[PDB]
Amino acid sequence: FFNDSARNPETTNKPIQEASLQIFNIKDYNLDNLLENPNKFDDEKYWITVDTYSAQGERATAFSNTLNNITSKYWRVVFDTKGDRYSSPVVPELQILGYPLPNADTIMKTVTTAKELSQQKDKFSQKMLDELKIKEMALETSLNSKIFDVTAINANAGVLKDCIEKR
Amino acid sequence: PSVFLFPPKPKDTLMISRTPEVTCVVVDVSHEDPEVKFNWYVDGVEVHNAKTKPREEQYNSTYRVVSVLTVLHQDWLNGKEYKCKVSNKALPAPIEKTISKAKGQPREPQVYTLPPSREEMTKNQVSLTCLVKGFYPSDIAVEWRSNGQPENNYKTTPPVLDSDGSFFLYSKLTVDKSRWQQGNVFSCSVMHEALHNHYTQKSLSLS
Amino acid sequence: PSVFLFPPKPKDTLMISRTPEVTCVVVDVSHEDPEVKFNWYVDGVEVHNAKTKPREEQYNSTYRVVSVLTVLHQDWLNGKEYKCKVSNKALPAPIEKTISKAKGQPREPQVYTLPPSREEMTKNQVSLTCLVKGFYPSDIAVEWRSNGQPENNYKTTPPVLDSDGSFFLYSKLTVDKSRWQQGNVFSCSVMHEALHNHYTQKSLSLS
Structure with a gap:
């Protein structure tokens, strides 16, 4: 996210002091509540803070930070200058950066569930639990690959898709 | 040369989607030396983001050099002194006008x-x-x-x-x-x- | 010197018991030569029934010579041109102002x-x-x-x-x-x- 100093160097606007990028808690609550009633859903409890900011230093053009491969398509963000009556936040642009990936939600549900199965110690033999880890790390490697080949991610996801049995 | 500083529209200053302007008109401008240099201050903080409006189609008589300044809503509502310092070559020293x-x-x-x-x-x-x-x-x-x-x-x-x-x-x-x-x-x-x-x-x- | 001719109060012109006035203020009057001779016309018919108002308190600086003229209601309502011709010694030729x-x-x-x-x-x-x-x-x-x-x-x-x-x-x-x-x-x-x-x-x- 950018401060107003990015747009107009000689600005009088106060920079964003503290901010919080957040994602919707899709697992807990219903999605159609937010669509119909977006007003009600505007509290920190309903969303999940993926990253925060605190300006413990000099003024800057922008703040940037990495994220842990998130998908949640519905986002919330807050900006606080903390400058008393009439101190409006000014953000020229807000960037959520990543890569295009059809069914990014489905693919990441495969990885997160695969971890939960490897947690289950007394579920399946080591022979099949080891097959899980090799299939999961294959995908996670293609996720955090420097070159972003989607076909390789789709392949490793498809391998890990039917690999999940359950019981 | 006479200067006429004007405030922004109430509707503009009370809606953040709209953009308020502090216009600084200058009438009876010298026909001999028509150069006008506007300086804009906001409590001493000189800004350089003004825009001289194009010479409208007045028939004759007197040059009327307008100068607009886009302002922050908060700055107006907080009540900062917007000062328009007009500077003409014919004028012995600059004419200032202030509004709040x-x-x-x-x-x-x-x-x-x-x-x-x-x-x-x-x-x-x-x-x-x-x-x-x-x-x-x-x-x-x-x-x-x-x-x-x-x-x-x-x-x-x-x-x-x-x-x-x-x-x-x-x-x-x-x-x-x-x-x-x-x-x-x-x-x-x-x-x-x-x-x-x-x-x-x-x-x-x-x- | 600037002249400012003013119309009568609406209430005065619509009630015959009340008396309407056509005030002719003159501001920025010469400090050197403060003599002001008012001439009053009504469609050319010069009247001589005016009254120069006494110099009100004033806060120094610039002389403000007022001149009142009592008018007939009918003459106002018919819409006769009341003309105030100010004459100052410093002024090269008289300033006229007309109202109706x-x-x-x-x-x-x-x-x-x-x-x-x-x-x-x-x-x-x-x-x-x-x-x-x-x-x-x-x-x-x-x-x-x-x-x-x-x-x-x-x-x-x-x-x-x-x-x-x-x-x-x-x-x-x-x-x-x-x-x-x-x-x-x-x-x-x-x-x-x-x-x-x-x-x-x-x-x-x-x-």
Whole structure:
């Protein structure tokens, strides 16, 4: 996210002091509540803070930070200058950066569930639990690959898709 | 050369989507030396983001060099001194003009919609009134809207100084009697700095 | 030296018992040569019945020589050109200023009294409104009176230009809710040249 100093160097606007990028808690609550009633859903409890900011230093053009491969398509963000009556936040642009990936939600549900199965110690033999880890790390490697080949991610996801049995 | 600094429109300063301007007109500008250098300050903080407006098509007589400055809403509402320093070669030393928001304890506008008169019901058109009193400063904006759709045919009186010290004004919405009797909604949309989101509405309908 | 000719009060020109005045102020008068000779004309007919007003308190700096002229009502209403020719020794040649009544088809003011708002009834004081629309010219006067006794606490808005071409204005009478609920009479007393005896009333009371 950018401060107003990015747009107009000689600005009088106060920079964003503290901010919080957040994602919707899709697992807990219903999605159609937010669509119909977006007003009600505007509290920190309903969303999940993926990253925060605190300006413990000099003024800057922008703040940037990495994220842990998130998908949640519905986002919330807050900006606080903390400058008393009439101190409006000014953000020229807000960037959520990543890569295009059809069914990014489905693919990441495969990885997160695969971890939960490897947690289950007394579920399946080591022979099949080891097959899980090799299939999961294959995908996670293609996720955090420097070159972003989607076909390789789709392949490793498809391998890990039917690999999940359950019981 | 005479300078004429002018404040922004109330509606612009009370809506963040709109952009307020502090115009600095200069009339009777020297025909011999027509160079005009504007300097813009905001409590000493000289800004350089002004825009000289193109020379409009005045027939003859006197050059009229306008200079606009886009301003922050907060800066106006906080009441910062916008200063327009005009500089002409004919002028021995620069002419400065300063402007700011009205200085005084702000007060909330009590908004009241009044229906047409009992006598006016005989006429084919009626006049929906909107009283707005007890507000300060005079910087205010009012608008009508029928069933969401912004209204065309209405007029608003200037802010008039009340006895206590606050201001007041009325706004006359002229509509057909058909739409009144049928039972539409008409909403007086007052906008003042001492309101929630600088905004408030009062609806009006037949009973 | 700058001259500023001013018209008579509407109330004075619409009541024959009162006496209307056409004031001719002169500001920035020469400090060196402060002699000012006013000449007064009425369609060329020079009159010599003016009265230079005494120098009011003033806060030094610049002389402000006022000159009043008592005028006939009929002469104003007929629309005769009152001309104020100022003559100063410093001034190379006399400055003339001319004034007359607004030229156009006069129109009758439709007077309408509106009661306090349904919301304002909660407040300890109320606002009695008097709409006056569809009149021309802007020369008009309005007054309230409760049970015959002239009212003190009211304010009238300036004449505002309406869509059709006529003017309009409101008049807010602030009274206690006690006197309203008890059931007194309040009368909006409009005065315009296009009325019977330049006068009309509309009463207002609780129902």
